[PDB]
From a paper:
In addition, we crystallized wild-type KtrA-ATP in the presence of 5 mM of Ca2+ and determined the structure at 3.0 Å resolution. The structure shows an octameric ring adopting a square conformation with L1/L2 distances of 30.5/30.5 Å that are similar to those of the WT-ATP structure. The intra-dimer interface shows a bound calcium ion. After refinement, we defined a coordination shell formed by oxygens from the carboxylic groups of the E125 side chains and the oxygen atoms of the ATP γ-phosphates. Unlike what we had observed in the wild-type structure with Mg2+, the R16 side-chains are not in position to coordinate the divalent cation. The coordination distances are consistent with a calcium ion but the coordination number (four ligands) is unusual and there could be additional interactions, with water molecules for example, which we are not currently able to model due to the limited resolution.
Numbering used by the authors:
A (entry chain A), B (entry chain B), C (entry chain A), D (entry chain B), E (entry chain A), F (entry chain B), ...: 6 to 222
Write the structure that this text describes.
């Protein structure tokens, strides 16, 4: 099993640490705040109060032993940048860091961060897509033009069949799944019916899907 | 006109406001900080400096005209809670609010928030899934058991065919798409080939996919 | 005997705790300030320094055992709201909370507070009634129209008898008590005399009493 | 004209100012905070931003015209004390001041305050009486021994008559009023009936009433 | 020997404590600052860190045993006033307090301070008298009209005799002493000579002395 | 014209400025606080808001015109020191400065201050002399050994004559003045009488006077 | 025109700006503090108040016109780093930055700083060399082994000649200059004499010079 | 060996302490910050946490034993000045102090500082000389007119000989050294060649050198 180190137990890093630990991985939670450590003590293999900008405390943690180190420090850009620098000079294989803005991304890029993440910005995009289009529940982009979308079926689609709703020739899309009352249906047959308030998964071009939304539902 | 209002120009709300504006929607940016307002002025239809906890300043914005109001206030839970309370008493149809923790979710729930979002927490889980499994790029959960995953093809899958990589019978899964050098292939034929570093889209049970990952790739 | 818990040893909560303890009830004083606890240590069954927003410290207090919990936190609305939420999730029978303003009342209402109190606001009304009318010492409202009032007798009423001051037919009111030099007289006979600077208790309609005040005294 | 001035727009003083204004009196609202002044501007004849510790600003208000000046300053004891001192040296007839603790009462006493009020402390006692005894709604003390109490009638008293509930001979008390469904009854006849959840007004000795509570209801 | 207590080890109180201790009196130095106590530890009989606003700590000091208590607290008027109040309620014979301004004097007056001192204000007057008149070194006022002054002899008075400088008939004053090279001369004879830069002590009317200054020296 | 400038409107400097102005001198009040300047505006010829550490603001005041500049800055030793330094480099004739402690005296000494004053320290000694000896009202030291003292006559000295109270032979001292009911007597004759509570002025050796106090009065 | 811009008017940057201006170069002084800008206004061609972390304010300065931009920001490492990042992305040719510590040097290095300076650190070494060796006034290092040193001639070297003080054969060094009473001598002849307290310039190996110091002087 | 004491472990003082310790001298590092002491603990003979403004702590250090004491306190001018004063009163032989500005220099001068240093200001001058003239690497001034300069050789001087570049007659200067690829050449012969990007050391008049720069290279 791979060993993970998470520095900065915020909302983001906290989720990572908690979710990773649930996966049965060796995860070390690191934070400068004692209260933070106490909170996630029950959600980590080891939890240590430490200042990650201190090289001596860093070596005391044995952070060189870890293949993955996650820097989830946000507000204090100084701490985030300085920590990443220390890690890179310690030849840490994989360093993932949470960024605050465009310029924070740039400096992390230059000092050799392996992966940079913008949690709020990315979610901001996702939720915005669901505001303008209440029909969509969730989605994933395959490219700039193609995407898979989970839709909330309306009354317009109630008791409609898959062959009634021709998507492969009329809109160039394909229905991938139907979720009814919790029960799930994968690669549903052309005779399969969709009822309102079910979860509908469609695959195809972005413009095509929206066209199906405007006309079909 | 569908009018959107975004209160709290943080990393999350800022993205929402910017992304909503990009889609060509009437969007009003609202913040207590003048510097924030000046920043997102170029990324909104209208940008106004205002304290959202003030009912008078709130009415001055013409907030009755908005169908959607997004409360993206984070650090100051008092402001977030009080703003949401004001909106519901002003009979705003749809109120989406960013939450800080479990208990903030609860109080927002009781006072009639329509949708509660945990941006950092949700991304934390997503990134954690990619930490433990370097193969996965992105995914979407259909249910507690079923998921769609975009995989980074390895050398083990280089120049391998779909009928060669039998997933419908061997693993109970199905290949949805292949992305090669940017070019995309939807519902690929059994003769379609996968090269290394291509994007592979697979659909099925979580455990099944992971089995394909360990043995297949 | 019923067991009471008082969180927030301010001027209000302090009085409650002190007065309840004097009544020979089991009362627990709780405050985040060590100095507060030391002050009311002599006025409680048990006095414990604790942060009421901490669920672990809350369970350590055994707050689930109490039928009555009084939240007298004022300035910090966050603490007051969060504490009440914790209590409600712990299924506490009776939760009384001190409020700061109209909107603080609303959120406490929504999260299931059993009784909300506005000490200063209510007293503000009481004292205001005594400013405009120096004759009144204290009072109680039976309804929007009817009230009982304690009056300071003037020279105009000196050596006047109850039958001389006809209140039942002339003003529709009734004299309930006379307090002379500390000595008290209940349901006084029609032959009973009132001297100046005595305490006079009258019952009837608000407008009628004021009429008696303008004309009678 | 009787002119009232309220200094210190807190919860207490704010209510006073608002309530005085409601009675149709000439009321001047005074506060050091501009936001406070703006708030109670609609609830006062005149509202002026001013530091009450400044004699020049005080004279500028035209404070000689006011017969009543209310000092409702709480947190800053220095401001409360200094303001009161200024008023008496400006020969203001009646100076009522809100007190924070025992020692604040003492110093205000020595410097010639006409009336000292303890809003939170007084309500604390009142509420405490209703905590230990859920039957009582409100009350007023005639003396150290005698009191008038408004009771919430129980099922034990449902459909019971006044002559049935003998209190003048059995408990030494007297029923003053009955409030049923909003309708009020003053000095009710011996044939008048009490239904559950009605408001019952009783007069007598404190111990006597409590005896009626334990045995009668 | 009399026992003295000095609260507030500032520049003023510090001098008092140091000077009193040098006189061989039992003096207690009291201050809230630990650093202050350490400084004057070598200049007092007993030195104790204590908050003088705390009644319990006050009794622990045994402050009731002292005939003289000096309150030399300046900046914090709250502490100065509250301390004096505690002392007066403890029936302390002689309470001397340092004042900050006119209104601080008034409240101390009302709460029963025995003597109030204005060190800086009084010295301000003294030094101002020496600025306008460089001839005067020091002085003492017998009344509004009469004073004793120590003068710095000029060249105009060099080698002048007392009988040459007639002061009893010409100016109505009298020379009291001559200080030459450190050597002192008391009640000097009419034949006694004064040299420049000696210290000259004159007694008489203020206007008369100034007249002697303008014409004589 | 002799022009005086007072920098630092504290208790000390404020008195100086006020007292100098009372004598009819051209006095400029200077302070960094606008509120201070407004206060002593009525007690100065000119009052200007200025930071005395700024050479430009200093020259703007027209400080070259002043022969006397008084630095009465206390708390901020940096400001006091820097101001004094500027004045000497601006070749100001006479610079008097208020000192905070021994070391502040030393640095001011080295940088060419003309006179250094310790207002609180000097009064502390004076008051201490009156604490140990309730008989003394005020005094002045002629040297290390000789002093003039104003005494409050006791009953022991009531109706006693000067020849009765022989001090020139019995104690080696001399009576300089007697103040009775406000009326003053200078160089009183051997037949002049002293009544109780009169002011007695004695001149001589410190030990001699104290001997007269113990035995004589 | 060669245009220089100096950002951060500290002790270091202030000297740079002042010195550059003295040489007759077009120099722009930039600082976030208005007081700083006002100060160096007289020592720059143009002086503008600006926050250097703001790209808009940066472009407003006309920073594209400058070939040299000096970042002399010290305390705020965030500002220093962010400013440098902005400059390189604005394609500024030569960016010189003042560093605070080793790690600040590293990050500035990675983001493309052209020259990094350690003013205090460099002087610290220089002064240290003069502490241990009182003979040396100043020096310059040619390499790790070779240096040029200016020495203060002792009495041991007074009236000694260059051929008398043989350094080319005896110590392997060479005398470059002699400064006597201000008068300078370059490449002095073998007959040239050295007097005490003259400035002696020697060139050679570090160890050789020190040997000459111990034995020769 | 001489014993050194360094107070104020900043960038400047830190370098001094580190460099001196490397020279094998007895050096004491003194700082009020515990973190500072821990940092330079490895770079000093003794390292002690102490407040240098405290005379008692100063004597505890045994600072009187040291011949050299370096005050490297910058930001807090009060501490720097007060420390120097203490040292001078302790008769410390050599006291070197770091200054912040012109006026800080003056007070240090007056209170008897032996040497005053301006690290940033001096370096500011040095670097400024290298900005305007990119050819110069480092230099030393012999006087106002004469200086030794280290130059970066250009292509214009590539493969040029010393006799080709006549400096003694044509420009009045002399080439002192050539540094090629790290290898150094001292007092190079007239036949010696210079290649580009070598370090060139020239000695002569400032204007003459610049003339050689403009025309020669
Ligand atoms: N030098 C440091 N060493 C260790 N932990 C640190 C350091 N600096 C910051 N942290 C921790 O990082 C955590 C989260 O950082 P912060 O909250 O500033 O970023 P954020 O973006 O606001 O967080 P979120 O992930 O909730 O958005 C905090 O709990 C803090 O204690
Ligand atoms: N009462 C208010 N009215 C209007 N705007 C407010 C109010 N309170 C806070 N804001 C704004 O909301 C913005 C975002 O708040 P904050 O930065 O605390 O969120 P966050 O927890 O950092 O979330 P994010 O992940 O979006 O950064 C702030 O820039 C602030 O100016
Ligand atoms: N999280 C907490 N846990 C325990 N006690 C708290 C907490 N937050 C506040 N308190 C306490 O509540 C007490 C009173 O609250 P606060 O004084 O803010 O309200 P208030 O309205 O100003 O008081 P008052 O009743 O005098 O009007 C304080 O003594 C404080 O210590
Ligand atoms: N010197 C002053 N002049 C005028 N107004 C003042 C002064 N000092 C305080 N105030 C005002 O008095 C108001 C009430 O004071 P404060 O909030 O401390 O009282 P409180 O103890 O909270 O009592 P309450 O129960 O009424 O809230 C404040 O809003 C403040 O603006
Ligand atoms: N509650 C308290 N108990 C004990 N000591 C106190 C208290 N409050 C203040 N002091 C002390 O009083 C001392 C002097 O008071 P402060 O310096 O505020 O008055 P000041 O007029 O500025 O002094 P100075 O006599 O130098 O003019 C301080 O050392 C402080 O520690
Ligand atoms: N740089 C400055 N320029 C002008 N005025 C100043 C400066 N620094 C301080 N002052 C003023 O000097 C005044 C007196 O200073 P401070 O109150 O610290 O003296 P203090 O020690 O309290 O002496 P006092 O016994 O006179 O009160 C303050 O009101 C302040 O406004
Ligand atoms: N973002 C910014 N934009 C413009 N100027 C800034 C910014 N941040 C700081 N400065 C300015 O830089 C100046 C120097 O910074 P600072 O005083 O922290 O440096 P220092 O470490 O003291 O170096 P020095 O040895 O030069 O004094 C400050 O006067 C400040 O006004
Ligand atoms: N009273 C004191 N006793 C001991 N050390 C002190 C004292 N005051 C300041 N110092 C120390 O002096 C050190 C440097 O001083 P400071 O950083 O204020 O000057 P600076 O000019 O900013 O430093 P630099 O040399 O980096 O320019 C700090 O580490 C601080 O701890
Ligand atoms: Ca966030
Ligand atoms: Ca209150
Ligand atoms: Ca003072
Ligand atoms: Ca510096």
């Amino acid at each position: 099993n791979k060993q993970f180190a998470v520095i900065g137990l915020g909302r983001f890093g906290g989720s990572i640490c908690k979710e990773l630990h649930r996966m049965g991985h060796e995860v070390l939670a690191v934070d400068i705040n004692e209260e933070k450590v106490n909170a996630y003590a029950s959600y980590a293999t080891h939890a240590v109060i430490a200042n990650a900008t201190e090289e001596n405390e860093l070596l005391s943690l044995g952070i060189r032993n870890f293949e993955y180190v996650i820097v989830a420090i946000g507000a204090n850009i100084q701490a985030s940048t300085l920590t990443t620098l220390l890690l890179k000079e310690l030849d840490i294989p994989n360093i993932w860091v949470k960024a605050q803005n465009y310029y924070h991304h740039k400096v992390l890029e230059k000092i050799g961060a392996d992966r940079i993440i913008h949690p709020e910005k990315d979610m901001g995009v996702k939720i915005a897509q669901s505001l303008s289009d209440e029909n969509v529940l969730n989605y994933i982009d395959l490219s700039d033009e193609y995407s898979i979308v989970e839709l909330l079926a309306t009354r317009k689609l109630d008791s409609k069949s898959i062959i009634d709703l021709n998507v492969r020739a009329k809109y160039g899309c394909t229905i991938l799944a139907i979720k009814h009352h919790g029960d799930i249906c994968l690669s549903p047959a052309p005779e399969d019916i969709i009822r309102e308030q079910d979860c509908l998964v469609i695959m195809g071009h972005k413009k095509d899907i929206k066209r199906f939304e405007n006309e079909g539902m």
